[PDB]
Structure 1
Amino acid sequence: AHFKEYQVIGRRLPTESVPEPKLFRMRIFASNEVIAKSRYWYFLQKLHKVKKASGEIVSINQINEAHPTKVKNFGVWVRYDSRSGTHNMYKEIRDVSRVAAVETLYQDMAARHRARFRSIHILKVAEIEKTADVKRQYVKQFLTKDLKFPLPHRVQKSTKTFSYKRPSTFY
């Protein structure tokens, strides 16, 4: 859906042999708290020997964007499962916030590789603080000095089923 980012902090259940476990923390892009906690336990079952019955979640907090009106370039490292194997990819997206960047990332992977939400693993997402570290041409195109371009062929959708003049596509 429209994604939100949460921090989820959890731990193992405390025993007498070891009280105070190590309080692992992860950042999850998810639609809500339930999906966020499910993905948290999914990745902790991939990492450490723990499961939901043997552990607990001590905190979940929404992390909204610090500057939601700054235009950033993000580099995203992704695992995905194809029909024959597992691959790593690095894609970079020029967008205004992290949740919108990963939303366009999920759309981009589903469009160009037919990869689903169950197949995509988000390794990391990070803002590229400096230009000329941008490595893709499709985003390096929009970083030029005095960028301007026209929008040819305007199509205006009509409300009536009949129009009384030939329309114009000037913009």
Structure 2
Amino acid sequence: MAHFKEYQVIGRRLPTESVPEPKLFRMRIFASNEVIAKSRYWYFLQKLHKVKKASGEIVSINQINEAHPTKVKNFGVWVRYDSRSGTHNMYKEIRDVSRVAAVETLYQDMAARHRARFRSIHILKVAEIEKTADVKRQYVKQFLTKDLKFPLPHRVQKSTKTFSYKRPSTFY
């Protein structure tokens, strides 16, 4: 729904006299802020366990920063989404420097290719593929060849002015 941050959200299923110290369930939620993070936490906990916001509590919320924000990684992403006619599971691969950037790319890509809005997508799993040759999508694999170089043909520079006096060039 915006530029994403990843939050660990831990909730409780609030204690009673019968059950003190309940079982402290945790989730990694990609959300643009903490209100949405906690909302998504309760949404998925209600999908998983007999609990709701009114019968539980948020024990903790903590943003998780990328441990290595400046190393390029290949992420495998497993999602579950609703199409116009059904629900489907999908696996994709995204090359980027952080989980939040990978997830933002994934949401953009789901919207672009499957018209799957945010509300229709569940992030099942995001995991860095530590070993290349376990990358199984060609659109990522092509970026892992040795000494990868490519030109950027047909450069289009934007003019600051309405009129130009030169009949410009697209060389690069």
Aligned twin of 1:67? 68
- Stretches of structure 2 that go unaligned for 5 or more consecutive residues are none
Rounded to whole Å, the distance in 1 between the matches of 2:16 and 2:78 is 37
Rounded to whole Å, the distance in 2 between the matches of 1:102 and 1:138 is 17
Q: Once the two structures are superposed, what CA deviation does each residue of 1:37-59 show, in whole Å capped at 9, x if it has no partner?
A: 00000000000000000000110
Rounded to whole Å, the distance in 2 between the matches of 1:164 and 1:13 is 72
Q: Once the two structures are superposed, what CA deviation does each residue of 1:8-37 show, in whole Å capped at 9, x if it has no partner?
A: 001111100111100000000001000000
Q: CA RMSD in A?
A: 0.4
Q: Once the two structures are superposed, what CA deviation does each residue of 1:76-134 show, in whole Å capped at 9, x if it has no partner?
A: 00000000000000000011100000000000000000000000000000000001000
Rounded to whole Å, the distance in 2 between the matches of 1:91 and 1:33 is 27
Matched, 1:149 2:150: yes
Question: Structure 1 segments of 4 or more deviating over 4 A?
Answer: none
Q: Find the residue that maps to 2:151 and give its secondary structure.
A: coil
Rounded to whole Å, the distance in 1 between the matches of 2:88 and 2:33 is 28
Aligned residues: 171
Q: Find the residue that maps to 1:12 and give its secondary structure.
A: coil
Rounded to whole Å, the distance in 2 between the matches of 1:151 and 1:15 is 64
Within 5 Å, give how 1:97-136 maps onto structure 2: 97-136=98-137
Rounded to whole Å, the distance in 2 between the matches of 1:159 and 1:18 is 68
Rounded to whole Å, the distance in 2 between the matches of 1:13 and 1:90 is 35
TM-score normalised per structure 1 = 0.99
Q: Percent identity?
A: 100
- Stretches of structure 1 that go unaligned for 5 or more consecutive residues are none
TM-score normalised per structure 2 = 0.99
Aligned twin of 2:58? 57
Rounded to whole Å, the distance in 2 between the matches of 1:37 and 1:63 is 14
Aligned twin of 2:93? 92
